[PDB]
Design a protein around this nucleic acid. Sequence first.
RNA 1: CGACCGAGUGGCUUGCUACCUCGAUGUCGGUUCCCUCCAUCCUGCCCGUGCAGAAGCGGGCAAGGGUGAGGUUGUUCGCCUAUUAAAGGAGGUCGUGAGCUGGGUUUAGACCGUCGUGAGACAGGUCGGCUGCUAUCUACUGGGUGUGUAGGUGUCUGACAAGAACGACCGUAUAGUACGAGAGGAACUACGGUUGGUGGCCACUGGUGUACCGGUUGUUCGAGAGAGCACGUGCCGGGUAGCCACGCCACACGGGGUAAGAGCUGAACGCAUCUAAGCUCGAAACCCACUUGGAAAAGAGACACCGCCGAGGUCCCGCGUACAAGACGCGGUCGAUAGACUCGGGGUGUGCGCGUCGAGGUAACGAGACGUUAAGCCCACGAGCACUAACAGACCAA
RNA 2: CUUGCAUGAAUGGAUUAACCAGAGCUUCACUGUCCCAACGUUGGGCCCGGUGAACUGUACAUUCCAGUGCGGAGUCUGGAGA
RNA 3: AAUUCGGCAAGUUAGUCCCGUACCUUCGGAAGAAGGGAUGCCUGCUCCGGAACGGAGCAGGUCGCAGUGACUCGGAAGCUC
Lengths: 132, 53, 337
Amino acid sequence: MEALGADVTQGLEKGSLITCADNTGARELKVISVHGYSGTKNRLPKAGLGDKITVSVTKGTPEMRRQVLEAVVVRQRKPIRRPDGTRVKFEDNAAVIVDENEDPRGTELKGPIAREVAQRFGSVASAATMIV
Amino acid sequence: RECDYCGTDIEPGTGTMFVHKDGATTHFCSSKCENNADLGREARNLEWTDTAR
Amino acid sequence: PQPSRPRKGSLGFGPRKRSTSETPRFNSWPSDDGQPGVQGFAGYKAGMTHVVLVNDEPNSPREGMEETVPVTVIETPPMRAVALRAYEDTPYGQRPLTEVWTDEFHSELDRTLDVPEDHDPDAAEEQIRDAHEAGDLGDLRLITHTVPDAVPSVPKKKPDVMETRVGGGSVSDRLDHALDIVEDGGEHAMNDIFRAGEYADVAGVTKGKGTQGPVKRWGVQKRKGKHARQGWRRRIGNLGPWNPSRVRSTVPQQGQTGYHQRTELNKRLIDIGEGDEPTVDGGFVNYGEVDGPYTLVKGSVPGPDKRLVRFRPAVRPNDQPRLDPEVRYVSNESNQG
RNA sequence: CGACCGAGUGGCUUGCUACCUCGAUGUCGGUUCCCUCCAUCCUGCCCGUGCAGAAGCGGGCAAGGGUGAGGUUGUUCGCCUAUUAAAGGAGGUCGUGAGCUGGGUUUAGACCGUCGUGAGACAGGUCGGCUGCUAUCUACUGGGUGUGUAGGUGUCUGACAAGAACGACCGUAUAGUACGAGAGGAACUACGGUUGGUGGCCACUGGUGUACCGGUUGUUCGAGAGAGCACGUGCCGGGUAGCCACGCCACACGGGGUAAGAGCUGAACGCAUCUAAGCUCGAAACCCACUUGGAAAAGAGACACCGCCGAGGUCCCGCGUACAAGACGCGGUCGAUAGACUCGGGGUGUGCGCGUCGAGGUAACGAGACGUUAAGCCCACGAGCACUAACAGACCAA
RNA sequence: CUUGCAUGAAUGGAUUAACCAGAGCUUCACUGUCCCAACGUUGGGCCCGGUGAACUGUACAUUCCAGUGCGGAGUCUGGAGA
RNA sequence: AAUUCGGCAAGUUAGUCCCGUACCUUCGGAAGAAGGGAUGCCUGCUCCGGAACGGAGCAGGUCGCAGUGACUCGGAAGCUC
Ligand SMILES: [Cl-]
Ligand SMILES: [Cl-]
Ligand SMILES: [K+]
Ligand SMILES: [Mg+2]
Ligand SMILES: [Mg+2]
Ligand SMILES: [Mg+2]
Ligand SMILES: [Mg+2]
Ligand SMILES: [Mg+2]
Ligand SMILES: [Mg+2]
Ligand SMILES: [Mg+2]
Ligand SMILES: [Mg+2]
Ligand SMILES: [Mg+2]
Ligand SMILES: [Mg+2]
Ligand SMILES: [Mg+2]
Ligand SMILES: [Mg+2]
Ligand SMILES: [Mg+2]
Ligand SMILES: [Mg+2]
Ligand SMILES: [Mg+2]
Ligand SMILES: [Mg+2]
Ligand SMILES: [Mg+2]
Ligand SMILES: [Mg+2]
Ligand SMILES: [Mg+2]
Ligand SMILES: [Mg+2]
Ligand SMILES: [Mg+2]
Ligand SMILES: [Mg+2]
Ligand SMILES: [Mg+2]
Ligand SMILES: [Mg+2]
Ligand code: NA
Ligand code: NA
Ligand code: NA
Ligand code: NA
Ligand code: NA
Ligand code: NA
Ligand code: NA
Ligand code: NA
Ligand code: NA
Ligand code: NA
Ligand code: NA
Ligand code: NA
Ligand code: NA
Ligand code: NA
Ligand code: NA
Ligand code: NA
């Protein structure tokens, strides 16, 4: 993929429960896999900011629940490093549901976003309320 | 830059930037300031703080 | 079905034993390209800080922008090429033929060497040119030593001797070039060899850590779960199969870790200068105050503070040189905090 | 794609045999850690196609590297999910219990079903049910003391030895191009990043930090002040140095020779023919390149200087860039090696005492608030500084 | 649901509130069980003075790679290394 | 909880007072179900009682990140055999 323009310490694992920052109808999401990743023996597969993950819907509307969909990580508690040395961290862990073409499934995003996510998913960013 | 807590100057190539739920932003100079804030304390009430001084 | 997995550690840096010479010894030299010249210099590790630079990389989407980069500070005072040694080509490899010395020696060179009181700088030189005429001349290298006395932060006054190769134009021309550097008094500086912005190979003897176990030494796992509570916490499962009925040297065991020689490639030189611009408030921890001939190396360097580190022009650079990077800020903040 | 029939190779399954062990070679499955095989799953390079392209299908060379995470089940096996370049198989006493685990098989207790007159049985199920030992030898990982080469100091050489020190992926430009009715849809090359592996480092972020400073509960020292105990910090808050990873730095290209394969010249055989002689190319594979070890390489090495009555060394003393003993490195008054003192640079968070305020209370009394006071206390770092201690001095040696 | 290889009525059948260091499964909370390990504390370990056993011992013994042999060899055979 | 046969080991919760409390049930119980709030010190007081160096409350003031401040001190709910 295109370079993020920042270093990321993955703060999420396979099985992690995170926040779905949108209005698709899904509230809580569970990470199942990370696109393009292949780890090593005994290592629990990891995900972080700017990564595209496969997810299952834990909470939300009856229809959205149990559905296996794709998503993009937008915010994470573990710190990341900007090119100027400064560290940046968020209040929670969140991702936005997305389709085959990387276009947000919902109509609106809930909460802030990392400027770095724009360099990868412009159509997701071009729906952002706040880009920090 | 200047620490949004103690007020001293943040040495370049140093510090952290916490992003709040609403999208607000707080640049910290050191862990000490981060931790005092987490206790619910306010820089103006601490004598060692430039803000307070 | 037992998943596949790469082995613990590398078999290429052994045997993992204590280094014989604390002073590193390069086993490779650059190619003879441009003009003649010495292919290496040395200094003493001081400590680290950070700097702000303008993006030099023409292929970066950020070129021209600010960028924070970590730097290891190294004091690089002038050294002295005290002699010119020549090698001859024989059916058994290269062998030392003869050496050419001087009269001007440092006041404390006698703390290590038995300084020459009677020498013949001509007979030796003659022998070298005769051999060159014969087409048996191998290569040309200068015997160099540092001046620890110049660096106050370093306790030792007793110099560090090392043989550095000289390469360049024609054998004849660099033979002459060498002779000149020596005759003077051998005095030379980092400027004469390196320019800010080039890539160098830094060698050194790492920080010793005495005896250590397999987990640390080889990077093997700790016992997991229930196994970690039985009587074994940091010991590998087995020393090998039933047959072969012997312990193979490839299995991870305990021993000496650190204090080995390593040669780290493609280290970029950020700035060669003098004075006290890079010194830290309160002094570098466990080292002291820097004020004089120094060198700013990108990233880390093998070894602890005070240890002798050697420079050599990168023998296998991955990129092209981008000279004199624009430095906008050198942190002087205290390293205590 | 491929029946029938025919000829084989392996030694993973199963069966047969009864050679070895019954004065015992500890079970299955798993785990950890090391080496290997090729009948190749991916990755390199090739050939054919019912090969337009793109995606395939089949075949050749090839064992460098890789081949991962999970849900049921003790399971091996196998079924299932989401990822992936791919998530290949097999050997090492079905590798591995003087390494671990103990869920299954297969002790003694008990239940159910079937069988039995009954004790009891079952190649049926089920709950419970123990893991001994101070390493003599050999083997390897690391550390020393001697002898050989036959005075010492410093610098090297390189027979050999180890390496995966690197493997792989995504993206951009090429290009919505070549190809194609259209749908769809590449490549050489150049760039940016990710992942797995590897070596080192701590400016930055993070952890620790029973150094340190502060708050506060219970109790004892009459109160106050200042302190002890409460597991080897009572608890709570912050945390320097160092050590660390979750942090940061570095890890080719290119040559040489080949395999499969593509060809040149070319004969036996006037022609043809990549081959028989000769030659041009051509694999992640081989050799070099690069990193690490390496004068005990018995052909036991080379050079320069000092010295053979004196060069150099051990002991001693102050210390660590070093360290389990030993070893290693540095300084020793021709001195800044350690300590004291003073600065500087740091950690806490405003000392005791006094003064004012203080809800109230006749008063006594009074939790607490402001000031004095970036105060008080503290430091595993640096500088200054010979004040103190590196003194006296012993021995070996051509 | 059920055709029960081979359930069934005091060889007791069905069933059940309360009780349980009894067998199986699920959720919230929690966490170094794990990802993936780090630093620290106390007692040992290591060096020194004193005290001072036992297990085991046909012999020889610096081994490695193959082979052979009663088909699972430090000792036989050929090499290699030392 | 991704660990493992299995959450084994460790951890979590915790004292007291007020509010409040499901299915089922042999009507006893289930039940501390669950869930929610409070908690120190200083000042002056009210009520019960003969009184306590007994107990229950009120008003105002006031410090800390934290008032069962250490210690002491349950993790909870459901299904089946
Ligand atoms: Cl996955
Ligand atoms: Cl284990
Ligand atoms: K037997
Ligand atoms: Mg596993
Ligand atoms: Mg045990
Ligand atoms: Mg620091
Ligand atoms: Mg800082
Ligand atoms: Mg045995
Ligand atoms: Mg083959
Ligand atoms: Mg192999
Ligand atoms: Mg076995
Ligand atoms: Mg195996
Ligand atoms: Mg064994
Ligand atoms: Mg055993
Ligand atoms: Mg044992
Ligand atoms: Mg069992
Ligand atoms: Mg069982
Ligand atoms: Mg059982
Ligand atoms: Mg002899
Ligand atoms: Mg104590
Ligand atoms: Mg009856
Ligand atoms: Mg599980
Ligand atoms: Mg598992
Ligand atoms: Mg338990
Ligand atoms: Mg009364
Ligand atoms: Mg408590
Ligand atoms: Mg059952
Ligand atoms: Na034990
Ligand atoms: Na134990
Ligand atoms: Na065994
Ligand atoms: Na056969
Ligand atoms: Na026997
Ligand atoms: Na086993
Ligand atoms: Na291979
Ligand atoms: Na399985
Ligand atoms: Na066996
Ligand atoms: Na076993
Ligand atoms: Na056992
Ligand atoms: Na080649
Ligand atoms: Na020798
Ligand atoms: Na019956
Ligand atoms: Na009982
Ligand atoms: Na722990």
